[PDB]
Amino acid sequence: AKYENVTKDIFDLRDYYSGASKELKNVTGYRYSKGGKHYLIFDKHQKFTRIQIFGKDIERLKTRKNPGLDIFVVKEAETVFSYGGVTKKNQGAYYDYLNAPKFVIKKEVDAGVYTHVKRHYIYKEEVSLKELDFKLRQYLIQNFDLYKKFPKDSKIKVIMKDGGYYTFELNKKLQPHRMSDVIDGRNIEKMEANIR
């Protein structure tokens, strides 16, 4: 249903993005499809996690067996269920971070502009838009009152080194069909957030 002048949805977004998340490192995912949907089931520490995959994941992880994967898990329901967040584990060696793009936050404040700049350290060759979106909103909720007020047109913009960019509209949850989108962590040039 459609609602007006209510904060239930933004508070729900706040609870989601400020909630728990977990990363499953170097795990093997077993693929299968059911009813038009595609999943990957994992096991680690005697715990089972089922991941629904979308986009390029459908064909990329076509084979039944899929080793060497890193998974960014956010419980949607519960065997815990989560959407996308699948990436190939690092193949190279890195002492620490492999990229340190600036995350620039700007906010209109009365007669001026407030700016906050931090480095969003990247440690993976492959990073899902899911993880970036979740961690970045997590940071905004914790430090910049995201969802304490209506976000309206607030957005996060992930700028790539080739000039292309991705956008995360903060007034709604990241679309499930986009949670399988992956990028090379080394190709992130900078990130920006324009908030209320």
Q: Which tokens sit at 70? A: 């890193």
Structure tokens at 11: 């508070």
Phi, psi of 140 (to 5 degrees): -70, -35
Question: Which 8-state DSSP code applies to residue 89?
Answer: P
Experimental method: X-ray
Beta-sheet pairing, 102-109 with 188-195 = parallel
CB–CB of 40/30 below 8 Å?
Answer: yes
Give me the resolution in angstroms, 1 decimal: 1.9
**What domains appear along the chain, each with residue ranges and CATH number?**
1-18+90-196 (3.10.20.120), 19-89 (2.40.50.110)
Report the C-alpha gap between 70 and 54 in whole angstroms.
16
CB 130 within 8 A of CB 83: yes
For the chain, list the strands marked E by DSSP: 22-34, 37-44, 47-53, 65-73, 80-83, 86-88, 102-109, 112-119, 126-128, 155-160, 165-169, 182-184, 188-195
What Å distances lie between residue 22 and 85, 137, 139, CA to CA? 11, 16, 16
Q: Estimate the crossing angle of helix 8-17 against helix 129-144, to 10 degrees.
A: 110
